[PDB]
C-alpha cells in the first residue's frame, strides 16, 4: 500500500505513510531502550509523549502540530489524511476509479451519423476494443493465438480494420464528458469507425451532454460484460435519453443550427414567388423549388395529411406553407399531432414542445427518427439559406442617437442644483437603467419589420434577428448588449455604474466603457468558475 518503488533516476519514491511508520518505529525503539536503560522519569514520560504524538500524526496528522517530513516541506499525509481528500476512498481510491478500457478524444460534429451512433477514431477503436478484436480474430480464425493477434493489431494491419468494423456493430460505448451534472452525461452510442482521431458526436445529443464542439474531450468507455454491453443499449443509449431527467422537456431538441434551419423554413411572408400555387405531393414542393418557381419563404399551398382524428385521415388540401411542409412530412402520422404544431414560427421553445409532443403522444422510435430527420433537414435548409452574420445583420436603431441625447440632457437638468445619491439614482436608474430598454425595444421593433423591396417582395429577415427569435443563440439581453445600449456595467460591490455608457459592440467602444464592461463581466466569468464549485459541492451532497 505504501510502496518504495525505484523511480527512474535511482531516487526511490517512498509513500507518505512509510515516513510516519518509520518515525513511530523510531519512537518505540527509543522508548524501549529508555525503559530497559532505566532513564530519568521525566525522559521516559517525555519519550512516551513523543511516541504518542508520532502515533497521532501517523493516523490523522491534523490534530497535532502537522509534523512535516524531514526531506520535503509538504504536510505528510496519514491514514486519516488519505481518506479525507480526493486521493483516498473519497475520490481517488473507490469512487473515482481510473477505469481502463477508456478513451479521451476531442469531439467533432457528427451530422452524417444517426442519433444513436457516435464517431469513434480508428486509432482509438483498436486500443479500446483490443480484447474484442482478439476475440473476433480468434473466432473468425484469422489469428492462431492471442500473441499473434496482439502482433497483428499492434502494427495496425489492413486485415484487422475489417474486423474492427465488424466487432463494433451493436457494441455501445459510454460517452463520458469531462463535467457531468446529470445521468445524461454518460450516454452509450453505437460507435462508427470514422476517419481522423476525433469522436464524431451527434449534434442533437451534445446539448444533453453539455458538450459544445469548441474543445470538449468526451471520455469514451467500452462495457466489457455481455450485460454491460447490453445495459448500454437498453438504458444508456442516446435514443432512450431524449427527455432530460430534470423535467418533462426533451433534451434532444436542436440547440443552435437545426433550430435556425427550422425557423428559416417556417418563416412565412405574404410576398414571395408562387403565391397560392397548389401542389400535389410533398415532392412537388421541392420539384418546383428546384425550378425557381416557388421560393422557401413558406407562402404556397399544397397537400399534406395531418392525421388528427382516429384512424387514417384523408389528404386534405391544407392552406399551409411549403417550408412548414418539409418539417411536417418529418412528423410521424398520429392523432393530436401534424401540421398544427408546425403552424407556429418553429422557434427553439416551439421545436422543443414539438419533440415533446411527438414523444408524449407517439413512441420513442418515431421520436428519435423524427429528431434524426429534422436535424438533417434543418442542416440542409440552413446551409442553403445563407444565415451568415454581417455588418448589416445587427442593425443599429436609427432612433438611438436622439434618444441618447435626450437621456443625457435629462441627466443634466436635475444635476445643476445637486442629495447627491438621489440625483445619481435618477441619472443611473431612470436615465440609463431606464430608456436602455427603450432603445433596445426600438431596435427590436426596427429589426422585426420585414423590409419590402421595390418588387413587392421582402428582401430578407436579419440573421441576428432570426437567431434571437428562434432561440438558437440570440436573446433580448444579448441583442441589447450587441446592438442596443449595452446597459450599465456592474461594480465590485454590486452597484451599477453611473457614467454614461452609450455604445454597442457593433460600434467602437472607447477604453473606459470597455474597461467597465470587462469589470462587470469578469465577475460573472468568475461566478462561472467559482459558483460552479458550489454547484459541484451541492450536487455531491445531494447524491450522497
Amino acid at each position: 500500500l505504501r510502496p518504495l518503488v525505484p523511480l527512474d533516476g535511482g531516487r526511490f519514491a517512498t509513500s507518505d505513510l512509510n515516513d510516519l511508520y518509520r518515525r513511530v518505529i523510531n519512537r518505540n525503539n527509543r522508548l524501549k531502550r529508555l525503559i530497559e536503560l532505566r532513564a530519568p522519569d521525566i525522559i521516559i514520560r517525555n519519550e512516551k509523549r513523543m511516541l504518542q504524538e508520532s502515533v497521532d500524526a501517523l493516523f490523522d496528522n491534523g490534530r497535532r502540530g502537522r509534523v512535516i517530513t524531514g526531506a520535503n516541506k509538504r504536510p505528510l499525509k496519514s491514514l486519516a489524511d488519505m481518506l479525507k481528500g480526493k486521493q483516498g476512498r473519497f475520490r481517488q481510491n473507490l469512487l473515482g476509479k481510473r477505469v481502463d478500457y477508456s478513451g479521451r478524444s476531442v469531439i467533432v460534429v457528427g451530422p452524417e451519423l444517426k442519433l444513436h451512433e457516435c464517431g469513434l477514431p480508428k486509432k482509438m477503436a483498436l486500443e479500446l476494443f483490443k480484447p474484442f478484436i482478439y476475440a473476433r480474430l480468434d473466432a473468425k480464425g484469422l489469428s492462431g493465438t492471442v500473441k499473434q493477434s496482439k502482433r497483428m493489431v499492434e502494427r495496425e494491419q489492413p486485415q484487422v480494420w475489417d474486423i474492427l468494423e465488424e466487432v463494433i456493430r451493436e457494441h455501445p460505448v459510454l460517452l463520458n464528458r469531462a463535467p457531468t451534472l446529470h445521468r445524461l452525461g454518460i450516454q452509450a452510442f453505437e460507435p462508427k469507425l470514422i476517419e481522423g482521431k476525433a469522436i464524431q458526436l451527434h449534434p442533437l445529443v451534445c446539448a444533453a451532454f453539455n458538450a459544445d464542439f469548441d474543445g470538449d474531450q468526451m471520455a469514451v468507455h467500452v462495457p466489457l460484460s455481455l450485460e454491460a454491453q447490453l445495459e448500454a443499449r437498453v438504458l444508456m443509449m442516446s435514443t432512450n435519453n431524449i427527455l432530460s431527467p430534470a423535467n418533462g422537456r426533451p433534451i434532444i431538441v436542436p440547440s443552435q443550427d437545426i433550430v435556425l434551419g427550422l425557423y428559416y423554413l417556417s418563416v412565412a411572408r405574404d410576398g414571395e414567388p408562387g403565391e397560392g400555387k397548389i401542389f400535389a405531393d410533398l415532392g412537388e414542393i421541392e420539384a418546383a423549388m428546384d425550378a425557381g418557381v416557388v421560393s422557401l419563404h413558406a407562402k404556397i399551398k399544397a397537400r399534406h395529411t395531418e392525421m388528427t382524428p382516429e384512424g387514417v385521415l384523408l389528404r386534405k388540401v391544407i392552406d399551409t406553407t411549403p417550408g412548414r411542409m418539409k418539417i411536417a412530412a418529418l412528423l410521424p402520422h398520429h392523432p393530436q399531432i401534424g401540421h398544427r404544431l408546425i403552424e407556429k414560427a418553429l422557434t427553439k421553445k416551439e421545436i422543443g414542445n414539438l419533440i415533446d409532443i411527438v414523444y408524449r403522444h407517439c413512441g420513442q422510435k418515431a421520436t428519435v427518427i423524427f429528431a434524426d430527420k429534422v436535424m438533417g433537414l434543418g442542416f440542409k435548409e440552413a446551409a442553403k439559406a445563407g444565415i451568415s452574420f454581417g455588418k448589416d445583420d445587427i442593425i443599429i436603431p436609427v432612433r438611438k442617437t436622439a434618444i441618447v441625447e435626450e437621456t443625457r440632457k435629462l441627466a443634466e437638468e436635475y444635476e445643476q442644483q445637486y442629495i447627491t445619491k438621489g440625483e445619481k439614482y435618477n441619472k443611473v436608474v431612470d436615465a440609463w437603467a431606464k430608456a436602455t430598454d427603450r432603445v433596445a425595444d426600438e431596435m427590436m421593433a426596427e429589426l422585426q419589420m420585414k423590409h419590402k423591396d421595390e418588387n413587392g417582395r421582402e428582401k430578407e429577415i436579419n440573421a441576428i434577428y432570426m437567431m434571437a427569435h428562434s432561440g438558437a443563440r440570440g436573446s433580448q439581453a444579448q441583442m441589447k448588449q450587441l446592438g442596443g445600449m449595452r446597459g450599465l456595467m456592474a461594480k465590485p460591490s454590486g452597484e451599477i455604474i453611473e457614467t454614461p455608457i452609450v455604445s454597442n459592440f457593433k460600434e467602437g467602444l472607447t477604453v473606459q466603457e470597455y474597461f467597465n464592461s470587462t469589470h462587470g463581466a469578469r465577475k460573472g466569468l468568475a461566478d462561472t468558475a467559482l459558483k460552479t464549485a458550489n454547484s459541484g459541492y451541492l450536487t455531491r451532497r445531494l447524491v450522497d
Partner: peptide, 11 residues
C-alpha cells in the same frame, strides 16, 4: 494554556 506541542511541553 493548552500548548498542544511536545517540544514546548518538554522545554
Amino acid at each position: 494554556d493548552r500548548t498542544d506541542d511536545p517540544v514546548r511541553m518538554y522545554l
